[PDB]
Amino acid sequence: MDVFLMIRRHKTTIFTDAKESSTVFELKRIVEGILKRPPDEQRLYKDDQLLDDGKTLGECGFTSQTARPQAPATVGLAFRDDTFELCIEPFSSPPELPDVMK
């Protein structure tokens, strides 16, 4: 089983793929190699709750049925030198549906 996700923080969304049998921690290090930040400095928030590094991708609520490539489940990111901060800034919104497409 593969899970597909986008990790957002500020205005930064990472399009990576991980396995449901992957641990949030192992994932925290998936940001280690790209965002250049320690796994003990990162805070991954599925929705407004958080994640124990041990929890496997799946139990957190990430199954193939809801983290698919054509619609990756989103994963918030919070970054700490002493206190952790979360905040994702929304995307742009489409123009009002033209009448001819109605």
């Binding site: 033209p98 001819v100 497409m101 109605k102």
Partner: protein, 148 residues
């Protein structure tokens, strides 16, 4: 004589048409003179047992849009002869369309063909949008690809 045609083998071959797409499938048989003959459609997820013959060529399309579907991960199907009356399986599936051909698909299903030119899009897209999938033109291309 056309290169994409069926062969009059008169040899029955029982085949399963299994529609694993979300499109209503329209199976097409290419007759002994190469001309495409439609056949009954198949709702999404439906499986039907079809009587066809060996050498006979089929292709499968969205019944309304005539958009392109695939069978057995290629675009044509030609049954072999059966072995111990095991049916030959024909799994129909959406191909991976280019994001541009996907978007043309959606926008053709939402605006009628008269209002293409009233859309706020570059004029190349109007020429593309009214370039509806046509099966006669995919045979022309497919025949030429038999260059192999």
């Amino acid at each position: 004589r056309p290169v994409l045609r069926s062969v009059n083998s008169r040899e029955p071959s029982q085949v399963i048409f299994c529609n694993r797409s979300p499109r209503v499938v329209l199976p097409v048989w290419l007759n002994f003179d190469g001309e495409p003959q439609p056949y009954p459609t198949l709702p999404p997820g439906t499986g039907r047992r079809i009587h066809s013959y060996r050498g006979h060529l089929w292709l499968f399309r969205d019944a309304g849009t005539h958009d392109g579907l695939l069978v057995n991960q290629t675009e044509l199907f030609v049954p072999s002869l059966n072995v111990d009356g095991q049916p030959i399986f024909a799994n129909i599936t959406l191909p991976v369309y280019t994001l541009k051909e996907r978007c043309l698909q959606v926008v053709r299903s939402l605006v009628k063909p008269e209002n293409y030119r009233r859309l706020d899009i570059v004029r190349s897209l109007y020429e593309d949008l009214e370039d509806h999938p046509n099966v006669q033109k995919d045979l022309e291309r497919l025949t030429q690809e038999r260059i192999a």
